[PDB]
Design a protein around this ligand. Structure first.
Ligand SMILES: CC(=O)N[C@@H]1[C@@H](O)[C@H](O[C@@H]2O[C@H](CO)[C@@H](O[C@@H]3O[C@H](CO)[C@@H](O[C@@H]4O[C@H](CO)[C@@H](O[C@@H]5O[C@H](CO)[C@@H](O)[C@H](O)[C@H]5NC(C)=O)[C@H](O)[C@H]4NC(C)=O)[C@H](O)[C@H]3NC(C)=O)[C@H](O)[C@H]2NC(C)=O)[C@@H](CO)O[C@H]1O
Ligand SMILES: *[C@@H]1O[C@H](CO)[C@@H](O)[C@H](O)[C@H]1NC(C)=O
Length: 361
Protein backbone atom coordinates (compact mmCIF):
# COMPACT_ATOMS: atom_id res chain seq x y z
CA UNK A 1 0.00 0.00 0.00
CA UNK A 2 1.07 3.59 -0.68
CA UNK A 3 0.81 6.33 1.95
CA UNK A 4 1.30 9.78 0.38
CA UNK A 5 1.86 12.54 2.94
CA UNK A 6 1.97 16.23 2.15
CA UNK A 7 4.11 18.59 4.18
CA UNK A 8 3.41 22.33 3.83
CA UNK A 9 6.04 25.09 3.43
CA UNK A 10 4.36 27.75 5.50
CA UNK A 11 3.86 25.60 8.61
CA UNK A 12 7.31 26.66 9.85
CA UNK A 13 5.94 30.12 10.68
CA UNK A 14 3.29 28.91 13.10
CA UNK A 15 4.13 29.92 16.67
CA UNK A 16 5.00 27.80 19.65
CA UNK A 17 4.42 24.07 19.38
CA UNK A 18 2.45 24.71 16.21
CA UNK A 19 5.78 25.14 14.40
CA UNK A 20 6.70 22.21 12.13
CA UNK A 21 9.90 21.41 10.20
CA UNK A 22 10.69 18.29 8.00
CA UNK A 23 12.55 17.23 11.17
CA UNK A 24 9.41 16.25 12.98
CA UNK A 25 8.50 13.74 10.31
CA UNK A 26 8.85 10.07 11.32
CA UNK A 27 10.67 8.62 8.28
CA UNK A 28 9.00 5.19 8.45
CA UNK A 29 5.50 6.63 8.64
CA UNK A 30 4.71 7.36 4.98
CA UNK A 31 5.93 5.77 1.76
CA UNK A 32 6.06 9.09 -0.05
CA UNK A 33 6.35 12.60 1.38
CA UNK A 34 5.38 15.49 -0.86
CA UNK A 35 6.59 19.04 -0.32
CA UNK A 36 4.21 21.87 -1.15
CA UNK A 37 4.57 24.04 -3.03
CA UNK A 38 7.02 25.24 -5.63
CA UNK A 39 6.78 28.37 -7.75
CA UNK A 40 7.15 28.87 -11.46
CA UNK A 41 9.38 31.79 -12.47
CA UNK A 42 10.82 32.81 -15.84
CA UNK A 43 8.79 29.79 -17.00
CA UNK A 44 10.96 27.53 -14.82
CA UNK A 45 10.26 25.65 -11.60
CA UNK A 46 11.77 27.45 -8.69
CA UNK A 47 11.69 27.65 -4.86
CA UNK A 48 8.92 29.46 -2.93
CA UNK A 49 10.06 30.57 0.55
CA UNK A 50 13.52 32.07 1.21
CA UNK A 51 14.76 28.99 3.01
CA UNK A 52 13.27 26.23 0.83
CA UNK A 53 16.78 25.10 -0.21
CA UNK A 54 17.42 24.32 3.42
CA UNK A 55 14.08 22.58 4.17
CA UNK A 56 14.40 20.47 0.97
CA UNK A 57 17.71 19.42 2.42
CA UNK A 58 16.23 18.63 5.85
CA UNK A 59 13.38 16.65 4.30
CA UNK A 60 15.58 14.70 1.94
CA UNK A 61 17.96 13.58 4.70
CA UNK A 62 15.09 11.54 6.17
CA UNK A 63 16.11 9.22 3.36
CA UNK A 64 19.32 8.39 5.26
CA UNK A 65 17.33 6.57 7.92
CA UNK A 66 14.86 5.05 5.45
CA UNK A 67 16.23 4.37 1.93
CA UNK A 68 12.88 3.12 0.60
CA UNK A 69 11.30 6.60 1.22
CA UNK A 70 10.46 8.53 -1.98
CA UNK A 71 9.97 12.31 -1.82
CA UNK A 72 8.30 14.64 -4.38
CA UNK A 73 8.00 18.39 -4.91
CA UNK A 74 4.56 19.84 -5.74
CA UNK A 75 4.03 22.77 -8.20
CA UNK A 76 0.81 24.74 -8.10
CA UNK A 77 -1.61 24.60 -5.17
CA UNK A 78 -4.64 26.82 -4.36
CA UNK A 79 -2.81 30.15 -3.49
CA UNK A 80 -1.32 30.05 -6.96
CA UNK A 81 -3.01 31.47 -10.07
CA UNK A 82 -4.88 28.85 -12.09
CA UNK A 83 -4.45 31.37 -14.87
CA UNK A 84 -0.68 31.18 -14.41
CA UNK A 85 -0.53 27.44 -15.21
CA UNK A 86 -2.91 27.96 -18.14
CA UNK A 87 -0.47 30.53 -19.57
CA UNK A 88 2.46 28.15 -19.25
CA UNK A 89 0.58 25.16 -20.69
CA UNK A 90 -1.21 26.54 -23.82
CA UNK A 91 1.86 28.10 -25.47
CA UNK A 92 4.37 25.55 -26.77
CA UNK A 93 7.48 27.71 -26.19
CA UNK A 94 6.55 28.21 -22.51
CA UNK A 95 5.60 24.62 -21.71
CA UNK A 96 8.81 23.06 -23.07
CA UNK A 97 10.87 25.58 -21.08
CA UNK A 98 8.98 24.58 -17.91
CA UNK A 99 9.39 20.89 -18.72
CA UNK A 100 13.14 21.01 -19.58
CA UNK A 101 13.76 22.80 -16.28
CA UNK A 102 12.31 20.18 -13.92
CA UNK A 103 14.65 17.16 -13.98
CA UNK A 104 17.70 19.39 -13.30
CA UNK A 105 15.97 21.06 -10.32
CA UNK A 106 14.73 17.79 -8.77
CA UNK A 107 18.16 16.11 -9.14
CA UNK A 108 19.96 19.11 -7.56
CA UNK A 109 17.76 19.14 -4.46
CA UNK A 110 17.30 15.38 -4.34
CA UNK A 111 13.58 14.83 -5.03
CA UNK A 112 12.38 11.60 -6.61
CA UNK A 113 9.49 13.09 -8.58
CA UNK A 114 7.14 15.97 -9.37
CA UNK A 115 3.51 16.44 -8.31
CA UNK A 116 1.19 18.57 -10.44
CA UNK A 117 -1.29 20.42 -8.26
CA UNK A 118 -3.07 22.53 -10.86
CA UNK A 119 -6.30 23.54 -9.33
CA UNK A 120 -8.02 23.75 -11.44
CA UNK A 121 -8.36 23.80 -15.12
CA UNK A 122 -11.42 25.23 -16.73
CA UNK A 123 -12.97 23.66 -19.77
CA UNK A 124 -10.68 25.49 -22.22
CA UNK A 125 -7.68 24.04 -20.34
CA UNK A 126 -8.40 20.27 -20.47
CA UNK A 127 -6.42 19.52 -23.68
CA UNK A 128 -3.51 21.57 -22.34
CA UNK A 129 -3.37 19.61 -19.04
CA UNK A 130 -3.20 16.43 -21.09
CA UNK A 131 -0.33 17.77 -23.21
CA UNK A 132 1.46 18.97 -20.05
CA UNK A 133 1.22 15.53 -18.49
CA UNK A 134 2.19 13.68 -21.70
CA UNK A 135 5.22 15.77 -22.61
CA UNK A 136 6.38 15.92 -18.96
CA UNK A 137 6.30 12.15 -18.59
CA UNK A 138 8.13 11.77 -21.90
CA UNK A 139 10.87 14.07 -20.55
CA UNK A 140 11.14 12.00 -17.39
CA UNK A 141 11.52 8.89 -19.56
CA UNK A 142 14.15 10.48 -21.81
CA UNK A 143 16.09 11.72 -18.77
CA UNK A 144 16.26 8.21 -17.27
CA UNK A 145 18.39 6.96 -20.19
CA UNK A 146 21.34 8.71 -18.50
CA UNK A 147 21.37 6.03 -15.80
CA UNK A 148 19.27 7.54 -12.97
CA UNK A 149 16.10 5.94 -11.56
CA UNK A 150 13.11 7.37 -13.45
CA UNK A 151 11.51 10.43 -11.86
CA UNK A 152 7.95 9.87 -10.66
CA UNK A 153 5.10 12.03 -11.85
CA UNK A 154 1.83 12.43 -9.99
CA UNK A 155 -1.12 14.81 -9.94
CA UNK A 156 -3.65 16.02 -7.38
CA UNK A 157 -7.07 15.71 -8.93
CA UNK A 158 -10.12 17.37 -7.40
CA UNK A 159 -13.22 15.31 -6.42
CA UNK A 160 -16.37 17.19 -7.40
CA UNK A 161 -17.99 15.65 -10.48
CA UNK A 162 -18.43 18.98 -12.29
CA UNK A 163 -14.75 19.83 -11.68
CA UNK A 164 -13.60 16.52 -13.11
CA UNK A 165 -15.76 16.74 -16.19
CA UNK A 166 -14.81 20.33 -16.93
CA UNK A 167 -11.13 19.83 -17.02
CA UNK A 168 -9.57 16.44 -16.63
CA UNK A 169 -9.23 13.81 -19.30
CA UNK A 170 -8.87 11.14 -16.69
CA UNK A 171 -8.62 8.27 -19.21
CA UNK A 172 -5.81 10.10 -21.01
CA UNK A 173 -3.76 11.25 -18.01
CA UNK A 174 -3.84 7.95 -16.04
CA UNK A 175 -1.75 6.31 -18.75
CA UNK A 176 1.09 8.72 -18.00
CA UNK A 177 0.80 9.46 -14.27
CA UNK A 178 2.34 7.22 -11.62
CA UNK A 179 -0.47 7.96 -9.14
CA UNK A 180 -3.42 10.34 -8.80
CA UNK A 181 -4.40 11.74 -5.43
CA UNK A 182 -8.15 12.33 -5.21
CA UNK A 183 -8.89 15.43 -3.11
CA UNK A 184 -11.88 13.85 -1.35
CA UNK A 185 -12.26 16.57 1.32
CA UNK A 186 -13.68 19.74 -0.22
CA UNK A 187 -17.34 18.70 -0.51
CA UNK A 188 -18.55 21.60 1.66
CA UNK A 189 -17.27 24.99 2.77
CA UNK A 190 -18.27 28.46 3.90
CA UNK A 191 -19.59 29.13 0.37
CA UNK A 192 -22.74 27.15 1.14
CA UNK A 193 -24.94 29.05 3.52
CA UNK A 194 -25.59 25.91 5.61
CA UNK A 195 -23.69 23.60 7.97
CA UNK A 196 -22.49 20.29 6.45
CA UNK A 197 -19.51 17.91 6.35
CA UNK A 198 -16.70 18.32 3.84
CA UNK A 199 -15.57 14.69 3.75
CA UNK A 200 -18.49 12.33 4.20
CA UNK A 201 -17.49 8.83 3.09
CA UNK A 202 -20.97 7.74 2.02
CA UNK A 203 -24.04 9.40 0.52
CA UNK A 204 -26.23 9.48 3.62
CA UNK A 205 -29.86 9.97 2.63
CA UNK A 206 -30.54 13.34 4.34
CA UNK A 207 -29.88 15.50 1.28
CA UNK A 208 -30.64 14.25 -2.27
CA UNK A 209 -29.27 16.75 -4.83
CA UNK A 210 -25.67 16.20 -4.04
CA UNK A 211 -25.58 12.52 -4.42
CA UNK A 212 -22.17 13.31 -5.81
CA UNK A 213 -20.49 14.85 -2.84
CA UNK A 214 -18.87 12.00 -0.97
CA UNK A 215 -15.69 9.96 -1.34
CA UNK A 216 -17.63 6.86 -2.37
CA UNK A 217 -19.16 8.45 -5.43
CA UNK A 218 -15.92 10.22 -6.42
CA UNK A 219 -13.93 6.98 -6.25
CA UNK A 220 -16.56 5.15 -8.32
CA UNK A 221 -16.66 7.93 -10.89
CA UNK A 222 -12.88 7.99 -11.32
CA UNK A 223 -12.99 4.23 -11.76
CA UNK A 224 -15.75 4.40 -14.41
CA UNK A 225 -13.72 7.05 -16.16
CA UNK A 226 -10.77 4.67 -16.62
CA UNK A 227 -8.40 5.55 -13.81
CA UNK A 228 -7.02 2.13 -12.78
CA UNK A 229 -7.44 1.30 -9.09
CA UNK A 230 -3.73 0.57 -8.66
CA UNK A 231 -3.01 4.24 -9.55
CA UNK A 232 -5.80 5.92 -7.63
CA UNK A 233 -5.07 7.33 -4.14
CA UNK A 234 -7.82 8.50 -1.77
CA UNK A 235 -7.25 11.78 0.04
CA UNK A 236 -8.04 11.80 3.73
CA UNK A 237 -7.93 15.07 5.65
CA UNK A 238 -6.27 15.68 8.91
CA UNK A 239 -7.86 19.10 9.43
CA UNK A 240 -11.40 20.19 10.13
CA UNK A 241 -13.58 22.96 8.77
CA UNK A 242 -15.25 25.31 11.20
CA UNK A 243 -18.29 27.53 10.86
CA UNK A 244 -19.79 30.33 12.94
CA UNK A 245 -23.47 29.49 13.55
CA UNK A 246 -26.20 32.04 12.80
CA UNK A 247 -28.76 30.69 15.31
CA UNK A 248 -29.04 28.02 18.00
CA UNK A 249 -29.81 25.48 15.27
CA UNK A 250 -27.01 22.90 15.51
CA UNK A 251 -28.43 19.99 13.43
CA UNK A 252 -28.12 18.87 9.80
CA UNK A 253 -29.05 21.88 7.66
CA UNK A 254 -28.51 24.51 10.39
CA UNK A 255 -27.71 28.06 9.09
CA UNK A 256 -24.32 29.83 8.93
CA UNK A 257 -23.06 33.40 9.45
CA UNK A 258 -19.67 32.44 7.97
CA UNK A 259 -16.34 30.62 8.75
CA UNK A 260 -15.40 29.70 12.33
CA UNK A 261 -13.00 31.83 14.39
CA UNK A 262 -9.31 31.10 13.73
CA UNK A 263 -7.29 28.60 15.72
CA UNK A 264 -4.51 29.69 18.08
CA UNK A 265 -1.82 28.09 15.92
CA UNK A 266 -3.05 27.77 12.31
CA UNK A 267 -4.61 31.28 12.19
CA UNK A 268 -6.94 30.78 9.21
CA UNK A 269 -10.72 31.48 9.12
CA UNK A 270 -12.71 28.23 8.66
CA UNK A 271 -9.85 25.77 9.25
CA UNK A 272 -8.49 23.94 12.33
CA UNK A 273 -5.59 21.53 12.68
CA UNK A 274 -6.42 18.23 14.35
CA UNK A 275 -4.29 19.25 17.33
CA UNK A 276 -6.37 22.42 17.70
CA UNK A 277 -9.51 20.24 17.42
CA UNK A 278 -8.28 18.05 20.25
CA UNK A 279 -8.10 21.16 22.41
CA UNK A 280 -11.52 22.38 21.14
CA UNK A 281 -13.30 19.12 22.03
CA UNK A 282 -13.05 19.79 25.80
CA UNK A 283 -16.51 21.01 26.75
CA UNK A 284 -17.91 20.58 23.25
CA UNK A 285 -20.66 18.23 22.22
CA UNK A 286 -19.46 15.51 19.93
CA UNK A 287 -21.94 14.20 17.35
CA UNK A 288 -21.57 11.73 14.48
CA UNK A 289 -23.47 11.43 11.16
CA UNK A 290 -24.35 7.72 11.10
CA UNK A 291 -25.01 7.40 7.34
CA UNK A 292 -22.07 9.57 6.19
CA UNK A 293 -19.79 8.09 8.91
CA UNK A 294 -17.93 11.19 10.02
CA UNK A 295 -18.13 13.32 13.18
CA UNK A 296 -18.80 16.95 14.02
CA UNK A 297 -18.51 18.85 17.25
CA UNK A 298 -20.09 22.06 18.42
CA UNK A 299 -19.60 24.49 21.28
CA UNK A 300 -20.88 28.05 21.78
CA UNK A 301 -21.59 29.38 18.31
CA UNK A 302 -18.77 27.35 16.76
CA UNK A 303 -19.51 24.23 14.70
CA UNK A 304 -16.69 22.02 13.47
CA UNK A 305 -16.78 19.21 10.86
CA UNK A 306 -13.74 17.00 11.31
CA UNK A 307 -12.13 13.50 11.16
CA UNK A 308 -10.95 11.31 14.08
CA UNK A 309 -9.30 7.89 14.40
CA UNK A 310 -12.57 6.02 13.83
CA UNK A 311 -13.53 7.90 10.65
CA UNK A 312 -10.02 7.86 9.17
CA UNK A 313 -9.74 4.05 9.79
CA UNK A 314 -13.13 3.63 8.17
CA UNK A 315 -12.05 5.53 5.09
CA UNK A 316 -8.90 3.44 5.04
CA UNK A 317 -10.87 0.18 5.10
CA UNK A 318 -12.97 1.56 2.30
CA UNK A 319 -10.00 2.12 0.00
CA UNK A 320 -8.69 -1.33 0.74
CA UNK A 321 -12.00 -2.94 0.02
CA UNK A 322 -12.05 -1.27 -3.38
CA UNK A 323 -8.38 -2.25 -3.88
CA UNK A 324 -7.08 1.27 -4.45
CA UNK A 325 -3.33 1.99 -4.47
CA UNK A 326 -3.32 3.72 -1.09
CA UNK A 327 -4.24 6.79 0.95
CA UNK A 328 -3.05 10.43 0.75
CA UNK A 329 -2.88 12.66 3.83
CA UNK A 330 -3.27 16.38 3.86
CA UNK A 331 -1.21 17.27 5.70
CA UNK A 332 1.31 15.92 8.18
CA UNK A 333 1.62 19.33 9.88
CA UNK A 334 -2.08 19.63 10.79
CA UNK A 335 -1.98 16.17 12.40
CA UNK A 336 -0.82 15.93 16.03
CA UNK A 337 2.83 15.80 14.96
CA UNK A 338 4.37 16.33 18.43
CA UNK A 339 1.79 14.04 19.99
CA UNK A 340 1.03 16.11 23.07
CA UNK A 341 -2.40 17.67 22.36
CA UNK A 342 -4.61 14.68 21.68
CA UNK A 343 -4.42 12.68 24.91
CA UNK A 344 -2.66 9.43 23.96
CA UNK A 345 1.10 9.83 24.02
CA UNK A 346 1.22 8.86 20.35
CA UNK A 347 2.54 11.08 17.59
CA UNK A 348 0.71 11.57 14.24
CA UNK A 349 -2.39 9.86 15.66
CA UNK A 350 -4.41 10.28 12.49
CA UNK A 351 -1.71 9.14 10.10
CA UNK A 352 -0.62 6.21 12.27
CA UNK A 353 -4.28 5.06 12.38
CA UNK A 354 -4.51 5.17 8.58
CA UNK A 355 -1.27 3.16 8.31
CA UNK A 356 -2.56 0.57 10.80
CA UNK A 357 -5.41 -0.39 8.51
CA UNK A 358 -3.16 -0.35 5.46
CA UNK A 359 -0.54 -2.47 7.26
CA UNK A 360 -2.87 -5.29 8.28
CA UNK A 361 -5.05 -8.12 6.95
C1 LIG B 1 -2.50 18.55 -2.64
C2 LIG B 1 -3.31 19.79 -2.82
O1 LIG B 1 -3.33 20.31 -3.92
N1 LIG B 1 -3.92 20.23 -1.72
C3 LIG B 1 -4.81 21.39 -1.65
C4 LIG B 1 -4.34 22.66 -0.87
O2 LIG B 1 -4.13 23.76 -1.74
C5 LIG B 1 -5.31 23.11 0.25
O3 LIG B 1 -4.65 23.80 1.33
C6 LIG B 1 -4.47 25.28 1.23
O4 LIG B 1 -3.48 25.77 0.31
C7 LIG B 1 -3.09 27.14 0.45
C8 LIG B 1 -1.88 27.38 -0.47
O5 LIG B 1 -2.12 26.88 -1.78
C9 LIG B 1 -2.75 27.57 1.91
O6 LIG B 1 -2.58 28.99 2.04
C10 LIG B 1 -1.54 29.29 3.00
O7 LIG B 1 -2.05 30.11 4.05
C11 LIG B 1 -1.10 30.36 5.09
C12 LIG B 1 -1.71 30.94 6.39
O8 LIG B 1 -2.75 31.86 6.14
C13 LIG B 1 0.04 31.23 4.53
O9 LIG B 1 0.98 31.24 5.57
C14 LIG B 1 1.79 32.39 5.40
O10 LIG B 1 2.83 32.05 4.52
C15 LIG B 1 3.63 33.15 4.15
C16 LIG B 1 4.59 32.68 3.07
O11 LIG B 1 4.02 32.90 1.77
C17 LIG B 1 4.34 33.66 5.38
O12 LIG B 1 5.13 34.79 5.05
C18 LIG B 1 6.35 34.66 5.75
O13 LIG B 1 6.23 35.23 7.03
C19 LIG B 1 7.29 34.81 7.87
C20 LIG B 1 7.01 35.33 9.27
O14 LIG B 1 5.74 34.83 9.67
C21 LIG B 1 8.61 35.31 7.28
O15 LIG B 1 9.78 34.80 7.92
C22 LIG B 1 8.75 34.82 5.87
O16 LIG B 1 9.98 35.34 5.42
C23 LIG B 1 7.55 35.21 5.01
N2 LIG B 1 7.79 34.65 3.69
C24 LIG B 1 6.96 34.56 2.64
C25 LIG B 1 5.83 35.54 2.63
O17 LIG B 1 7.13 33.75 1.73
C26 LIG B 1 3.32 34.06 6.42
O18 LIG B 1 4.00 34.44 7.61
C27 LIG B 1 2.42 32.86 6.71
N3 LIG B 1 1.50 33.14 7.82
C28 LIG B 1 0.32 33.76 7.84
C29 LIG B 1 0.22 35.05 7.09
O19 LIG B 1 -0.63 33.30 8.45
C30 LIG B 1 0.63 30.53 3.30
O20 LIG B 1 1.53 31.38 2.62
C31 LIG B 1 -0.39 29.99 2.28
N4 LIG B 1 0.30 29.10 1.35
C32 LIG B 1 0.87 29.53 0.21
C33 LIG B 1 1.56 28.50 -0.66
O21 LIG B 1 0.87 30.71 -0.15
C34 LIG B 1 -3.81 27.05 2.91
O22 LIG B 1 -3.46 27.20 4.28
C35 LIG B 1 -4.09 25.58 2.68
N5 LIG B 1 -5.18 25.17 3.55
C36 LIG B 1 -5.07 24.27 4.53
C37 LIG B 1 -6.34 24.00 5.29
O23 LIG B 1 -4.02 23.67 4.82
C38 LIG B 1 -5.83 21.93 1.09
C39 LIG B 1 -7.09 22.29 1.90
O24 LIG B 1 -8.26 22.13 1.13
O25 LIG B 1 -5.94 20.68 0.41
C40 LIG B 1 -6.01 20.70 -1.02
O26 LIG B 1 -7.21 21.28 -1.50
C1 LIG C 1 6.87 33.47 -7.58
O1 LIG C 1 7.04 33.85 -8.95
C2 LIG C 1 6.33 35.02 -9.29
C3 LIG C 1 6.11 35.10 -10.81
O2 LIG C 1 7.32 34.72 -11.43
C4 LIG C 1 7.11 36.19 -8.68
O3 LIG C 1 6.66 37.47 -9.13
C5 LIG C 1 6.95 36.06 -7.15
O4 LIG C 1 7.81 36.98 -6.46
C6 LIG C 1 7.12 34.62 -6.58
N1 LIG C 1 6.20 34.55 -5.46
C7 LIG C 1 6.51 34.31 -4.15
C8 LIG C 1 5.34 34.33 -3.19
O5 LIG C 1 7.63 34.06 -3.69
Amino acid sequence: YKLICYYTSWSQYREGDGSCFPDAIDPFLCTHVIYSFANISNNEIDTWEWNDVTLYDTLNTLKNRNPNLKTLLSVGGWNYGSQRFSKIASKTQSRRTFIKSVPPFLRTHGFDGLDLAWLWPGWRDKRHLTTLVKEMKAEFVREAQAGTEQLLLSAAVTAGKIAIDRGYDIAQISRHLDFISLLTYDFHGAWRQTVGHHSPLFRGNEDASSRFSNADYAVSYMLRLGAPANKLVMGIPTFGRSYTLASSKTDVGAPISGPGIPGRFTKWKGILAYYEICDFLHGATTHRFRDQQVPYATKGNQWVAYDDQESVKNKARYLKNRQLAGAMVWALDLDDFRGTFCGQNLTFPLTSAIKDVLARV
